[PDB]
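TEACHING EXERCISE
Course module: macromolecular assemblies
Task: Read the component lines below, then compare them to the predicted structure of the full complex.
Student: A.B.
Group: 4
Components provided:
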Amino acid sequence: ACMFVPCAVRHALGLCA
Amino acid sequence: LCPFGEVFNATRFASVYAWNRKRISNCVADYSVLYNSASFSTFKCYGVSPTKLNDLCFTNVYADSFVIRGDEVRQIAPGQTGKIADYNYKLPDDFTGCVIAWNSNNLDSKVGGNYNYLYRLFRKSNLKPFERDISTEIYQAGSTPCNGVEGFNCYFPLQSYGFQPTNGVGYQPYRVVVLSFELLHAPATVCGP
Ligand SMILES: *CCC(=O)N1CN(C(=O)CC*)CN(C(=O)CC*)C1
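Instructor-supplied answer key:
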């Protein structure tokens, strides 16, 4: 559902906040 | 007793947009791994000789480390252009140190893809040498401002590599270590044995 970097991966890498 | 060994042997490596820097100072340098240059796929020294580093003394030594594709290692050199040199990790023209890389497909690739390694796909301009950018600001791809909202023409700036073990060697993950030997106007703290 997320382009470029999947949402779960964005959370895992600390990219959501 | 400099921790050069731990830079190479670190279990985790950084994504290239968030390249890790380790400052080395006030220690005795063990340059043994640099003598084993035949074991690395890339080993290019600019203004340095591993067999002469024992005789030299430095104020600081920075060890930058990250994962990129093998076909991108050529960009970790002076005077290069491309997605990595431009938006992720830039070496200067006057660079002095070594660029060391090795294939890490066995560790960093996963079946289905390892999406945990990223690179910056979008940026308003190129990086200056040694500039680091870890912002996740939404990228304005159209003429209309995004106001930080991700969507139509407003893109997440970073991209997953999705490393797979069956991809060709040029698309496989390589771990890179860049050593910058700095001798500034200060007392030398990194000396040989
Ligand atoms: C693709 C964008 C998206 O679905 N969401 C925005 N967002 C993040 O980007 C977190 C880094 C919050 N969302 C989620 O956490 C669910 C995937 C929603």
